[PDB]
Amino acid sequence: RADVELERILAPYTDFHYRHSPDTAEGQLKEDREARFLASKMGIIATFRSWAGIINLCKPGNSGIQSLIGVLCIPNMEIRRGLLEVLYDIFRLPLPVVTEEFIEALLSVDPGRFQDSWRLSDGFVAAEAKTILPHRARSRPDLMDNYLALILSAFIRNGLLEGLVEVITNSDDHISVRATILLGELLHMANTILPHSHSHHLHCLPTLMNMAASFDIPKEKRLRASAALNCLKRFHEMKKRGPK
């Protein structure tokens, strides 16, 4: 069928009160919910690796990718904190630590952070040099970049940056930090793998700059927008520093 069979797998996220089984034990209601969330995430990040799923979820109609972005712009701190994990592992980005300050979660996503493989017993120097030192290829295609660029373009077309901005401003701090870091990672990926026409107007961020410069809205939104811009600049500096 058209829009009712494959789009069922993202019902646990789009339906705030989702009941999968008609008759289940009333004792387990939160563990069942977490299991549903985990299975739906594992299915959603598995349909975006195939072309028949990418094309069928991003159809120009009332697709299932716009219903996934639209529920991200609703202040529900349970679905909103679970969609960010799917967005993080769709783009193969590392998750920061669960904190409320940006300067602590920015340190956990450092490309040069210590790993267990770099110990003398495991991988002393050879494994460490692989992570921090770059590959010798400067013109190889690297199909991974092709796939990530296609996915990022498909997500930007359906208004992902506006949803991320709305999550950054009108939400809690635990989720604001994670959405700011995701926005920084996506903005860095844009100016690296996207063609110039696709990424020459993304760095303007109109919906966030017009909020950080409007003195008619309440002052809390303006100040948190300015703080988000400052954190984005800090993330860009961290990215242009490099792994040490």
């Binding site: 069928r1 009712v4 019902a11 789009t14 008609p22 219903s67 639209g70 529920v71």
Partner: protein, 73 residues
């Protein structure tokens, strides 16, 4: 009452308003969750109304009751 021509006119407006497309996020979520069963149930009801046979209405009512029990929780 064994009134099939009553339940038909009771639940036909629902299928009618459901085939004009969901317009909100709640309606889209409902169409993603329960939308598949409510189409095969209508297909079975139509197959029954074409050729009268309770063997075709029993499956439609199976689907309807499953959807009802999932909604009522």
């Amino acid at each position: 009452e064994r009134n099939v021509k009553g339940m038909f006119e009771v639940l036909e407006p629902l299928h009618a308003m459901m085939e004009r497309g969901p317009q909100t996020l709640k309606e889209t979520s409902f169409n993603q969750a329960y939308g598949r069963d409510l189409m095969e149930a209508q297909e079975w009801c139509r197959k029954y109304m074409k050729s009268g046979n309770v063997k075709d209405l029993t499956q439609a009512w199976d689907l309807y009751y499953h959807v009802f029990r999932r909604i009522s929780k």
